Write an enzyme that holds these catalytic residues in place. Sequence first.
Site, PDB file in Angstrom:
ATOM      1  N   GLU A  56      23.365   5.549  57.898  1.00 18.51           N
ATOM      2  CA  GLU A  56      22.811   5.678  56.432  1.00 18.51           C
ATOM      3  C   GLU A  56      23.323   6.704  55.715  1.00 18.51           C
ATOM      4  OE1 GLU A  56      18.525   5.853  56.342  1.00 18.51           O
ATOM      5  OE2 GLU A  56      18.572   6.463  54.389  1.00 18.51           O
ATOM      6  N   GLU A  94      17.386  18.485  59.551  1.00 18.70           N
ATOM      7  CA  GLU A  94      16.620  17.363  59.207  1.00 18.70           C
ATOM      8  C   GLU A  94      15.451  17.670  60.458  1.00 18.70           C
ATOM      9  OE1 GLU A  94      18.847  13.789  58.203  1.00 18.70           O
ATOM     10  OE2 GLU A  94      17.035  13.430  56.864  1.00 18.70           O
ATOM     11  N   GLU A 101      27.917  16.073  58.033  1.00 21.99           N
ATOM     12  CA  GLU A 101      26.589  15.262  57.950  1.00 21.99           C
ATOM     13  C   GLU A 101      26.023  15.975  59.155  1.00 21.99           C
ATOM     14  OE1 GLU A 101      24.770  13.742  55.418  1.00 21.99           O
ATOM     15  OE2 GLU A 101      26.509  14.913  54.693  1.00 21.99           O
TER      16      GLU A 101
END
Lengths: 55, 438
Positions: free
Chosen positions: B52, B129, B122
């Site tokens: 995603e 996160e 990422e």
Amino acid sequence: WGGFSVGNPTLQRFFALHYLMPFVLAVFALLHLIALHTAGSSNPLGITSNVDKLS
Amino acid sequence: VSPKTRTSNLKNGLTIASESNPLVQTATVGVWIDAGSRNENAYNNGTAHFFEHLAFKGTDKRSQHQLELDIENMGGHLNAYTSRESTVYYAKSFKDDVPKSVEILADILQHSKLAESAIDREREVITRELEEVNKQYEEVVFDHLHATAFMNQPLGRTILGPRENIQTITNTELRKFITENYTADRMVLVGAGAVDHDALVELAEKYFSHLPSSQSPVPLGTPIPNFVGSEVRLRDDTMPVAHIAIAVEGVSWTSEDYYTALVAQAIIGNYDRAVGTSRHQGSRLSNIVSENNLANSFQSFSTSYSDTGLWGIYLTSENTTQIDDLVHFTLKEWNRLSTSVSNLQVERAKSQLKAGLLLSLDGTTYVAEDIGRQLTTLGRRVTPAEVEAKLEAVTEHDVRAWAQKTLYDKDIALVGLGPIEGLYDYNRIRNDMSMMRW
Ligand code: HEM
């Protein structure tokens, strides 16, 4: 004794007191539990259990 | 009476589903996929969520920057989300910007670069996160709830995945995941708002025609979960609010008890001290909680998956010495679904739901989400007339029978977060799942 040796007066008074004393004993047993309730039960490790209590 | 949902297929087996609304000027088109974290194993857990991020990191044509610009020039936005069983990628735009948005979505799904440099970049963002979800208490509670209810099973895994996997996810395994899972027979192209169905089918034939078909095409919304009665306690005395979730194993999308479980959920309902009307709600639990200040809020839920579900309640409270009462009264209201409910509560909940299921769909994004969810879980969009009939079929006998087999004296999954010293141990909570007087 209520007399000059152990006899009838002694036996009758022991019956009355023997009937009574267990009630006094129950009251003191309750008193020692109420006194304990402020700290709670100790435990086998001897440390606080305030960190980890069970109902 | 809302316009009819039109549905077409392509040759590969891609479904196109649309609901036009000539009163709006915007349109939400997107791709609902019947795939999500649950399709990973233990080694590649986190891949779906990883992808995603990379979907927006550049394609074979447009670079990351070009992608940004192209969408900026469209005027609307793109959005995506990955769940356990479902992935969505959609674009909200203007009426006449729909062909652009379909083209961009087709590009990011089929032709994404997944360049080692971007994977590596990422890999840090996603690692950060992991340490910031920690703040979203509702999500923390629900993720622990799935982890314990479905202990060591695929539904029990998180979407982010473990730290270990984040460091070891390669472009190879990313590519493998989207090749196995993002197949045409698992995908639905949805349009809601100012879309023409026939125009959308043409755009599908132009952009999504070279999608792989799976070898063995099962129907949309095709799946064994073994629920574990269990508890997770995340005590934190420094937090002022306790967050507690209690759930039992609930119902799947295609259960025959699906509507019965929704009605039962509506009998308990929701509550929030911040909303003015909440002190006047009809729900018994609402009245108990508001009169006694037991909670800041509670929210009943009935989450469904393809082959299982979770039915329960999420509570928040600052009343740290009466958490016991809050949990006690909540579970005694559940007991009453088994012992006491009559036509009075059932018909009231049915009334409230007949509207609620229609009211929810109040914008193009909500409509698209409804078409997409229903197509990927049931294989069809269920008309409001059918839904009204299924609700009307729920009797008080159905609710009692359902609660007696699902709630009464059953194991719960319980998660507590925050100042939860007053939350009793598992046995005392689980003992409230029945009533000795009955
Ligand atoms: C009728 C006689 C008695 C009864 C029914 C009784 C009952 C109890 C009970 C129910 C407790 C709490 C549970 C336990 O720790 O076992 C307790 C604790 C205690 N009792 Fe007794 N008791 C009696 C006599 C005594 C005597 C003779 C003593 C001391 C000489 C005593 C000293 C204590 C103490 C210090 C505790 C706290 C122990 C702890 O939890 O760390 N009791 N008793």
